[PDB]
Structure 1
């Protein structure tokens, strides 16, 4: 079990290097993607090339779950992992390519 955070974004992992936002949008055809292809952002490195990962925004948390039910399916050639991403996580991993979560639970 893995969650990035409570957000209207999902995390799309296992995408081919040869795909654009069109193919990823077509993958989430059963999901209402926020702002269309502008809601989709591949995690591009300093090398100007995608990690094979993206963040897709969605209109509703229900739509996020419809994205999560397709977590397994083969896109391009490979199996795709669909996680649940927060607006905070999505923004930070696009600016700073790092799957390391801001783990802070000062509890007692």
Structure 2
């Protein structure tokens, strides 16, 4: 099956320190029900602990958009997690640590 770049991926950002797998599912709500098999990838930092970034690939791009809209800076317990939709390419790009231009 050819890897198709669909915008079915979502980047969560600002996740709590040690937000658990069920905790993140709660946060997702019903959107966790349409997640692709092992679609949830948490980004770890040097220490081997979450960067606060996570990428979740859902089955459907429409659901991903809906989730990214629903959770675009949503209050997760006591934190605000800003969720943004992404493509498979964007997901890999951030995971690979692609060149992101920010003159700051």
Could you state the TM-score of these two structures normalised by the residue count of structure 2? 0.76
Runs of 4 or more consecutive aligned structure 1 residues displaced over 3 Å after TM superposition: none
- Name whichever of 53-62 and 69-78 sits farther off: 69-78
Q: Quote the RMSD (CA, aligned, Å).
A: 2.2
Query: Which structure 2 segments of 5+ residues have no match?
Result: none
Deviations 1:8-29 (CA, angstroms, capped at 9, x unpaired): 1011011101212322222112
Deviations 1:58-80 (CA, angstroms, capped at 9, x unpaired): 11111012212221211142111
Q: Secondary structure at the match of 1:34?
A: strand
Could you state the TM-score of these two structures normalised by the residue count of structure 1? 0.73
Query: Which structure 1 segments of 5+ residues have no match?
Result: 102-108
Match of 1:75 in 2: 76
The alignment of Structure 1 onto Structure 2 pairs a total of residues equal to 94
Distance 1:39 1:6, change over 3 A: closer
1:86-105 equivalent positions in 2, closer than 5 A: 86-96=87-97, 100=100
Q: Secondary structure at the match of 1:28?
A: helix
